Design an enzyme around this catalytic site. Structure first.
Site, PDB file in Angstrom:
ATOM      1  CB  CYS A 203       2.502   0.756   7.242  1.00 44.86           C
ATOM      2  SG  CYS A 203       0.886   1.235   7.685  1.00 44.86           S
TER       3      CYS A 203
ATOM      4  CG  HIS B  72      -0.537   0.356   2.602  1.00 43.78           C
ATOM      5  ND1 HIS B  72      -0.934  -0.806   3.510  1.00 43.78           N
ATOM      6  CD2 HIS B  72      -0.046   1.092   3.110  1.00 43.78           C
ATOM      7  CE1 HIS B  72      -0.124  -0.487   4.552  1.00 43.78           C
ATOM      8  NE2 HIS B  72       0.476   0.774   4.285  1.00 43.78           N
TER       9      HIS B  72
ATOM     10  N   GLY C  80       2.422   6.171   9.750  1.00 44.77           N
ATOM     11  CA  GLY C  80       3.727   5.924   9.274  1.00 44.77           C
ATOM     12  C   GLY C  80       4.369   4.805  10.036  1.00 44.77           C
TER      13      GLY C  80
HETATM   14  O1  OIK Z   1      -0.127   4.722   8.654  1.00 44.67           O
HETATM   15  C1  OIK Z   1      -1.126   3.843   8.704  1.00 44.67           C
HETATM   16  C2  OIK Z   1      -1.544   3.522  10.186  1.00 44.67           C
HETATM   17  C3  OIK Z   1      -0.923   2.273  10.388  1.00 44.67           C
HETATM   18  N1  OIK Z   1      -1.349   1.826  11.763  1.00 44.67           N
HETATM   19  C4  OIK Z   1      -1.847   2.493  12.577  1.00 44.67           C
HETATM   20  C5  OIK Z   1      -2.407   3.804  12.288  1.00 44.67           C
HETATM   21  C6  OIK Z   1      -2.988   4.500  13.427  1.00 44.67           C
HETATM   22  C7  OIK Z   1      -3.404   5.846  12.770  1.00 44.67           C
HETATM   23  C8  OIK Z   1      -3.475   6.407  11.484  1.00 44.67           C
HETATM   24  C9  OIK Z   1      -2.884   5.629  10.670  1.00 44.67           C
HETATM   25  C10 OIK Z   1      -2.259   4.289  10.927  1.00 44.67           C
HETATM   26  N2  OIK Z   1      -2.206   3.920   7.657  1.00 44.67           N
HETATM   27  C11 OIK Z   1      -3.207   3.373   7.779  1.00 44.67           C
HETATM   28  C12 OIK Z   1      -3.343   2.079   6.563  1.00 44.67           C
HETATM   29  N3  OIK Z   1      -3.060   2.635   5.382  1.00 44.67           N
HETATM   30  C13 OIK Z   1      -3.675   1.956   4.148  1.00 44.67           C
HETATM   31  C14 OIK Z   1      -3.643   2.607   3.028  1.00 44.67           C
HETATM   32  C15 OIK Z   1      -4.024   1.966   1.676  1.00 44.67           C
HETATM   33  C16 OIK Z   1      -4.458   0.660   1.864  1.00 44.67           C
HETATM   34  C17 OIK Z   1      -4.331  -0.191   3.094  1.00 44.67           C
HETATM   35  C18 OIK Z   1      -3.942   0.502   4.427  1.00 44.67           C
HETATM   36  C19 OIK Z   1      -1.923   3.027   5.314  1.00 44.67           C
HETATM   37  C20 OIK Z   1      -1.703   4.518   6.337  1.00 44.67           C
END
Ligand code: OIK
Ligand code: OIK
EC number: 3.4.19.12
Lengths: 304, 304
Positions: free
Chosen positions: B145, B41, B143
């Protein structure tokens, strides 16, 4: 989201762990520059545990009696000295993995990560607090002495603790990196009173703010209180008295959540007086006090 | 003595963390040999979150669109491919800090350490379990991930998890290092049902054995039970059914304490039926299920 008892990444400290042996005793040392720091009780025998004369014991020891090994390689000891309850072994080689570091004596209620080690080898890492009674609730077995506690600020490791002993009650005691014990403890195999351990109120409040930020809001109420009214409740429950300095430290969390510090205090007062009623906060059934306001902001902001 | 939620030392994994950017999206990657592994992603935009066609999105990307930085130095990308939900970016340089490693797909109920990272920089380390419902209760922000979960066996790092997303309920989901999600989750910004999360019974029992070893014995009773009688109680409380394989795994802890596994089961049955009555076990007011029998033996034996 999510809130965990997070420790600092331990890599910078793993690179400083060495094994120190003197006679039949082996423990851990911390190798920084050309010095290896370790608990002075490494020079003790079975008959020198109840009442050691460290000065007399150390006199019978020469540089070659201190065996220091970094991984599989032997370090050459060219000097030795005792500073309070730690020995400083000067070696002929500076640790190439020495990180940017500081020696700091932490305040009770502050947190730090511990890298538990055995035979100079790291076994695990956990986060803990220096209790108000200057003990730590760690996880240490025989051979863990010399394992250290630290904090990381970007690239600088602030070493704050060296493990020396386990009290008969299962709690842990040790020194700063200048060898001065936290608390009234002495490096002797004698019964030692830890003292009454109070709950770190400002940390419990910081954790309640973390709970609100992370969705747990059931405990929030329609009440407020005053510092003096709150402290009457804190005294009854063996909680540290909250001061304006603690309120000021909770300022950024109060601003982030929009909940006044005295309002959170009233929620805490009600939780103390009524209990959790079988409910949980951040996966816990008791009030957690080993996260400072700085730890909460750090974990909820992503400081690397 | 003492029992803490201990994580593995993270040094070997810190040396593998890199930052990966594609377009305007930045996350973490794992650099092992000449390959950087990251969540696919990373190629998504704001309009490609609800229903991404990863195959079509990836077609618009070339090697030079993937910016990989290890510390302050840029890595040259000479290949890219998608394996399930992970991208594998071939770089021209093998990671000199690559530890001995394995990719393993862990079983639900097993534990692992997570090194939370942001912009390729480690922020903290914590221990967690793969829940029976294949989610993790982590601590992750935007951030994070690409941050990984792992186990360490002497010098070998077994990578078992890569962080991909946070469900609307605040729990976390991700993949093994072959890019296959644990559970029914998909890398799409859609509402996804995690499923009923049960308590890992064999882990709760292992923790009760840890409690006995560490002096907490108030909960031990004069009763015993059978696997079938115990499981009638476990079902009622959303606990995993205990099997003979679980009893066999608890054998070494049962031998160390001298408490038969079915006797400990009767203590657990009474704790479930009666609650803790305001009491604690290993500093906890609820029954802890994120320590395996192996974790208990390891922590109580000092495996480095
Ligand atoms: O960085 C993160 C994330 C991860 N873990 C905890 C979090 C808590 C609060 C806010 C964001 C997050 N994301 C969330 C998933 N995300 C994504 C994009 C496309 C397809 C599938 C998933 C990319 C951005
Ligand atoms: O290695 C340890 C130790 C440390 N932490 C936790 C433990 C849990 C169970 C058993 C032992 C320990 N000791 C205990 C203190 N000890 C010592 C010797 C002389 C003077 C003062 C202290 C040296 C040996």
């Amino acid at each position: 989201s999510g809130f965990r008892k997070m420790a600092f990444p331990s890599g910078k400290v793993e690179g400083c762990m060495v094994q120190v042996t003197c006679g039949t005793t082996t423990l851990n040392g911390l190798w920084l520059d050309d010095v290896v720091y370790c608990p002075r009780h490494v020079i003790c025998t079975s008959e020198d545990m109840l009442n050691p004369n460290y000065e007399d014991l150390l006199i019978r020891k020469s540089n070659h009696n201190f065996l220091v090994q970094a991984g599989n390689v032997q370090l050459r000891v060219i000097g030795h000295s005792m500073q309070n309850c730690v020995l400083k072994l000067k070696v002929d080689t500076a640790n190439p993995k020495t990180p940017k570091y500081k020696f700091v004596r932490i305040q009770p209620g502050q947190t730090f990560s511990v890298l538990a080690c055995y035979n100079g080898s790291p076994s695990g890492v956990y986060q803990c607090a220096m209790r108000p009674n200057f003990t730590i609730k760690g996880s240490f077995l025989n051979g863990s002495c010399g394992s250290v506690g630290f904090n990381i600020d970007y690239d600088c490791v602030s070493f704050c603790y060296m493990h020396h002993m386990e009290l008969p009650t299962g709690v842990h005691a040790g020194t700063d990196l200048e060898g001065n014990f936290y608390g009234p403890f002495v490096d002797r195999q004698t019964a030692q009173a830890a003292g009454t351990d109070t709950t770190i109120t400002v940390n419990v409040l910081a954790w309640l703010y973390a709970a609100v930020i992370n969705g747990d809001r059931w405990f929030l109420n329609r009440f407020t209180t005053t510092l003096n009214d709150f402290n009457l409740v804190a005294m009854k429950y063996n909680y540290e008295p909250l001061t304006q300095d603690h309120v000021d430290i909770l300022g950024p969390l109060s601003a982030q959540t929009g909940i006044a510090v005295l309002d959170m205090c009233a929620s805490l007062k009600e939780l103390l007086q009524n209990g959790m009623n079988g409910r949980t906060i951040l996966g816990s059934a008791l009030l957690e006090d080993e996260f400072t306001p700085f730890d909460v902001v750090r974990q909820c902001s992503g400081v690397t």
